[PDB]
Design a protein around this ligand. Sequence first.
Ligand SMILES: [Mg+2]
Ligand SMILES: [Mg+2]
Ligand SMILES: [Mg+2]
Ligand SMILES: [Mg+2]
Ligand SMILES: [Mg+2]
Ligand SMILES: [Mg+2]
Ligand SMILES: [Mg+2]
Ligand SMILES: [Mg+2]
Ligand SMILES: [Mg+2]
Ligand SMILES: [Mg+2]
Ligand SMILES: [Mg+2]
Ligand SMILES: [Mg+2]
Ligand SMILES: [Mg+2]
Ligand SMILES: [Mg+2]
Ligand SMILES: [Mg+2]
Ligand SMILES: [Mg+2]
Ligand SMILES: [Mg+2]
Ligand SMILES: [Mg+2]
Ligand SMILES: [Mg+2]
Lengths: 138, 87, 59, 110, 224, 107, 101, 44
Amino acid sequence: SRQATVKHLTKYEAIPHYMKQTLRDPHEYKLRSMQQIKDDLKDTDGKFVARIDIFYKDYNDAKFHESAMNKKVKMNVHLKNWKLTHSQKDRLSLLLGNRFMCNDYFTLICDQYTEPELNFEKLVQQVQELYLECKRAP
Amino acid sequence: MGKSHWRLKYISKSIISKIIKESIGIKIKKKISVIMNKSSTIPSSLTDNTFYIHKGYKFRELKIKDYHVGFKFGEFILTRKPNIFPK
Amino acid sequence: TQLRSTVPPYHLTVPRAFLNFDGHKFKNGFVLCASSVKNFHKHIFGPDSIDFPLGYSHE
Amino acid sequence: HAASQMIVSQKHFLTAKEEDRLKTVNQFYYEADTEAWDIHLAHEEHTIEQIENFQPPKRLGVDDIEEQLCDLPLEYYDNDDGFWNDFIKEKLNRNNAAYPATQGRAFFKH
Amino acid sequence: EFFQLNGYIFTKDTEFINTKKKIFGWNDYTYKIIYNRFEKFYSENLISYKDTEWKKFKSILSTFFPKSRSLKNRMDTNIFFLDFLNTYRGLRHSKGLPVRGQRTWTNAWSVYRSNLNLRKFKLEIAKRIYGNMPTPSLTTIYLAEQINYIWKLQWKREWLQARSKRLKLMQNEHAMFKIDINSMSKGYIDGFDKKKENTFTLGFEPGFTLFYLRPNKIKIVLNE
Amino acid sequence: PYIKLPNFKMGINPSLRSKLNPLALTGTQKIMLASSRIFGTNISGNLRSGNSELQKKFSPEKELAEFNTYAHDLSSGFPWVQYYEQKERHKMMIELRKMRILMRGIK
Amino acid sequence: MLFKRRKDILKCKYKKIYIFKNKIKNIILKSIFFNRNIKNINRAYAYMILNNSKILYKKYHKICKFSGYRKNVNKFTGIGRHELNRKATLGQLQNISMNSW
Amino acid sequence: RFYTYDELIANRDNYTIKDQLNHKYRFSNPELIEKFNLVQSDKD
RNA sequence: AAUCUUACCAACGUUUCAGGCUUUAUCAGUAGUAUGAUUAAUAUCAAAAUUAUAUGAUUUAGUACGGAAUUGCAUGGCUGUC
RNA sequence: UGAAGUCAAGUCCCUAUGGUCUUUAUACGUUGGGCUACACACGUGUUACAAGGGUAAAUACAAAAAGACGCAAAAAAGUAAUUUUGAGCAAACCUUUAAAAAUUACCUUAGUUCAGAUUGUUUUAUGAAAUUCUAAAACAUGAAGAUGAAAUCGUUAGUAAUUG
Ligand SMILES: [Mg+2]
Ligand SMILES: [Mg+2]
Ligand SMILES: [Mg+2]
Ligand SMILES: [Mg+2]
Ligand SMILES: [Mg+2]
Ligand SMILES: [Mg+2]
Ligand SMILES: [Mg+2]
Ligand SMILES: [Mg+2]
Ligand SMILES: [Mg+2]
Ligand SMILES: [Mg+2]
Ligand SMILES: [Mg+2]
Ligand SMILES: [Mg+2]
Ligand SMILES: [Mg+2]
Ligand SMILES: [Mg+2]
Ligand SMILES: [Mg+2]
Ligand SMILES: [Mg+2]
Ligand SMILES: [Mg+2]
Ligand SMILES: [Mg+2]
Ligand SMILES: [Mg+2]
């Protein structure tokens, strides 16, 4: 079952301009460079490794024209290897958007191609492109 | 009533062929004056021109004038002959 | 879009005297406010509806 | 000239002068004695006060645009430092080795 | 003093509330928009004997609506302008038949009674030509007048046959004949070959009723 | 008729695509744009673009997969069939009519 | 010539094959036509080509392979009305049963 | 030789082509385009 | 029941098999298409670009022509009702 | 879930088939039109003639069913229909679904803040295409109707009726 959606009256309408809340953009600063990042992982000598969890499905029904049913490749990624700051975390919660994310892990899905291999490597190209753009913050 | 304005008005393959033949200066004639696809809107270039419109097993005639622009061809023509209960 | 062609009371004169939750301004002073919801049904009211600081409220 | 006429070929909106003449007309129909309507408009009588027509609906032209948008690229890169400049060149050059993009392109040419 | 707008006349004794039922086009939503502009309530009067209210009353209240116009008259023109060009919707407003594809074999009764705009707009036109003759006779004419104009255009092969028969005896006999307008008001006709297989009805050119009523050999039949 | 009335509200009807100033972008705006390159999202105004018709799914071949079965007509799907008996009855009944047709033509 | 079924199946066949191949063409043209942010001309020139095509292979309507009857069809099975009443006698339908709620 | 992929990006914006555009009757019957110039010029 | 459907009316057009098999003759810079022109439309014509993919495209003869045309008072089949 | 068989009940026009007829036309393809006509009248069914009603505002509880030539959350815009956008799911996992009622307040028995036809004009959605011949929203139009003659129908408890 599902309860019905209702639009509650959270905020009252007419509240003075001085008494409202406004919050600056904390992501406004000088972005990091590259060697600043590589200097963090000196224990590993320029080598990072990520722990992940790969879901995948198969069907007996994926055939002549429903052969596209086997294209999704769902993944999770663990974060405790990522020494995430307060500012790096919020940046990461924005790139994913309105997507699942916890302190421990977050999801990553691709259904862009027919063959799952091509949808699997693309996840790796996303995980890289998200770790760098995330650790570009301090 | 009509469509929304942004849904642009319909002019079929045929009348687009005729508008070009106007543009060349090729006059309208026996077959070129003929019209089908009544839902096609009544363009603006073809003022001062006769067009024999089709219904059923014969035709209707009209001339275009600036007031007639914008409308549809089939809104000037009658298909079903009116019904009158006899005495 | 929230007001929709109405007048707020922080522009109305008489509410200005009392709208401001300014009790600190009064030497030897104190302020008390409340929230009536009889005309409303299941209306969750609190200091999140009004952007309002913590601590200065009592459920 | 052919495509625009799915825009310019448009319903006619009436002026206030035309409607005071719609009443004082005599003929019921128009195609019969068409010229008399052109005559019945031409009568000028400024004794009446000044006139204001209604505003026609929000029509829109041929070259016009409904809502303009800020232009952006496909892939917005912060290249001010310029780090992503290297991540791209190998990326694209890798794709061509596996799945080229050198196609006959019967339609567009560059 | 007075002020006119939308065909309604204002004075300094009026009550802008009770204009609601009277004016044609301004029921509820607009007055709310209007009282927002006056920054006053429904209960207060927007009009007073002082000139400040009066000029303020007119300056605001003119922005909504263009002066020297109406909505009622604009409505009828947009109806007559359709029949004025010999359109499909032009007939169905005149006869009393539906416009929106609504059916007829059972139920079109609310159209026949309520929709009375194009009808009254033609009676006044007939008086401008054929004088102050009583109405039910005038009804016989412009009904009979439009019909031949239809058959002339749409069914042109039939009009010519009605025209040919008239012109044969015209040259030969020089005798009299007649016109059955009272038959043509109801839509009855004569004068061609059917698939089923002296008076004439249909062969005329338009405006003929002017040619005969208002100039011996020809005699009109209006009533019966 | 066309009743128009003034809208005392002003300004462009706001949108994400319209809040953006590409010359002066915030941090929260570069971040969303950095998501769009990754996953291919779209940013557009309140008005209609064609992406809803580029993202749709339209599989007409799935009907052809029924027409290509040829269960209904074996000869179209498996031409080696030759219904011998049904042809025999079709030939006998014809020839016997032609006996009747000629013998009735005389009679 | 061909009997009614084997003919009409082909008509409703050629109507789909046309659509299958002019799919990408008619999706892009129709994409531009609904793109409000663009000028009206390019929105119209696409509308001009979008109509400059065989409409005859677009007037598709369903049909039953067996009976040749078009109006009532079961999409769950892909066959008709007069036939399912027959196969149900023979029980040829797989896994089906009579609803007793 | 053939070009690489990188070298073509250098010639990305170099638009050498002459008079490329949406057209009608051009490569088939350019005579009518000339008539189309005459008629609308005659109306001026 | 907007077109198709849909059998009906009007008009333009077609004259005998979709696939497979057999067979007669010609063409191969020809053939085809998300191409182009042409007609109201099917049709018909064709080289600006593009596709070239094994054993072609077109044509004659043959391989159960066809039929919402009629008789439910010749029948099946399916079904209502008592 | 429903015997034997009757009503020469109905259908050859879903498909099959005997007899009969047609075969350059009673066959075939396409374009447009038509099946939607309108004097009178019948059967069926929805909505109403009001205050155990109408409306505004704030705001609860369901089942069954369906989903990729799909369902489409969250946020945002619009007056509203609806649109931008497409996280997530081929699934008891994600998604599409309530109203009446109840609470507070107004309207105060008036052809009316009832009723809601019909018509004009923009806007909204699908489509190649809405004029003939679609559905919906808003501004505005705001007709009949004031619980129905003689006669006649349904129902037997989670039934009538009401609500979606
Ligand atoms: Mg209280
Ligand atoms: Mg309509
Ligand atoms: Mg959408
Ligand atoms: Mg359909
Ligand atoms: Mg039809
Ligand atoms: Mg047809
Ligand atoms: Mg037939
Ligand atoms: Mg019988
Ligand atoms: Mg019978
Ligand atoms: Mg019917
Ligand atoms: Mg009620
Ligand atoms: Mg609310
Ligand atoms: Mg939810
Ligand atoms: Mg939502
Ligand atoms: Mg997704
Ligand atoms: Mg209630
Ligand atoms: Mg009344
Ligand atoms: Mg009401
Ligand atoms: Mg009463």
